[PDB]
Amino acid sequence: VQLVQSGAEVKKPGESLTISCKASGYSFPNYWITWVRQMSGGGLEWMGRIDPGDSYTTYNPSFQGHVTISIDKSTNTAYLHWNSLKASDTAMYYCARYYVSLVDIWGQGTLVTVSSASTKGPSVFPLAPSTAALGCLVKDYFPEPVTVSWNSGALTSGVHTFPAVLQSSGLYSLSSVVTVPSSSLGTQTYICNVNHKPSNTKVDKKVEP
Amino acid sequence: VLTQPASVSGSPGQSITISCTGTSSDVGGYNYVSWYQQHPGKAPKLMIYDVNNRPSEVSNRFSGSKSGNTASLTISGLQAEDEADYYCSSYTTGSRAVFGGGTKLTVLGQPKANPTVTLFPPSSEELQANKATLVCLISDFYPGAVTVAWKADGSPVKAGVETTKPSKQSNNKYAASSYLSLTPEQWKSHRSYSCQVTHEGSTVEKTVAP
């Protein structure tokens, strides 16, 4: 039983937005589908529930008229739709199976960032060895997130991608450090793969002394 | 919103209790009270349902109680892994549902750990673009409070400093970052720059030089 949610979304206030939730592994018309919102640093907020047998919905009054929950019984899909987004809608949204009184199965969550600021792609610089610690500075990007891999996924040990800093410019910086034997520095290539989906940025930098 | 304490703490082996006070349209009109555990970067996991019922994947250390419009979640043999956020849910009149504000459970026995500081100077690729940035990476510290100070030749640097709030790692220790943005001329003028990290009264310094 999986509830697969749609990808992350970077939008601007006033734009429409539809996020989806595909259910699989059970009889869809027999369980309710609920939507739960959680802001960054905040708590869980119930938004509404829908019965996919007859599309009957119930909403939290604070969200009624601002968002719409809908169902597609032919495709086992649940939809959450905004006609006009607000910056206060920036949050993570989970779809979840609701059975009588509990919430048993959750989705992975869809991150929705609503900002009038511009998507900016990062600048990648190598933090060179001077055990040794190599790294990569990911500088000036919006919005979050950035993902950093080393060696196309082969270097997973010693990898610490430190958390990002929101700078005064309104942009973010991040640093990823891999600790390596100081004897491989001359015999082993170390490449940082920086991926920033909001800007469609994908860069690879080789870190050399 | 159901009312929960903002924070609750305890020691390993001890038994802690989290309250959840609602009205009679939620906790006091139904026996449908659910308890959820959420770890950072994870979705919530059902811990207790129907007031006292417990699912099969939950240790018997987790019990539920209801007393009027107040519900209660008890955790008996405290482990470090129990440190998370705990949310109560209730079924409300009109086929609605309601969540609580959240309780941060803290396990109060973790051992003091000193921070490791790694300081990276600006890269040539960045100085070529007429930019300079020094990077201080602070790792493996507990508790999660640090002070960062930058010095150029011993003199306190005032501007260009951007520091993160401490954040928990996989080892239950804390990590932080400090970035000092400089122009290439400032970077090439001073003999040395230092990042000083103060934690629990002790200061650890790292230095770089062009």
Author numbering:
A (entry chain H): 2 to 131, 139 to 217
B (entry chain L): 3 to 212
The authors write:
Whereas traditional therapeutic antibodies have been limited to extracellular antigens, T cell receptor mimic (TCRm) antibodies can target intracellular antigens presented by cell surface major histocompatibility complex (MHC) proteins. In prior work, this TCRm displayed high specificity and showed no evidence of off-target recognition.
We also determined the crystallographic structures of the unbound TCRm and AFP/HLA-A*02 complex. Although the resolutions of these structures were lower than that of the complex, electron density was clear enough to show that, in contrast with many TCR-pMHC interactions, there were no large conformational changes seen in either molecule outside of changes in side chain rotamers, small rigid body shifts of the TCRm variable domains, and slight remodeling of CDR1H. The rigid interaction between TCRm and AFP/HLA-A*02 likely further contributes to high specificity and affinity, as more flexible interactions between TCRs and their ligands have been associated with higher degrees of cross-reactivity.
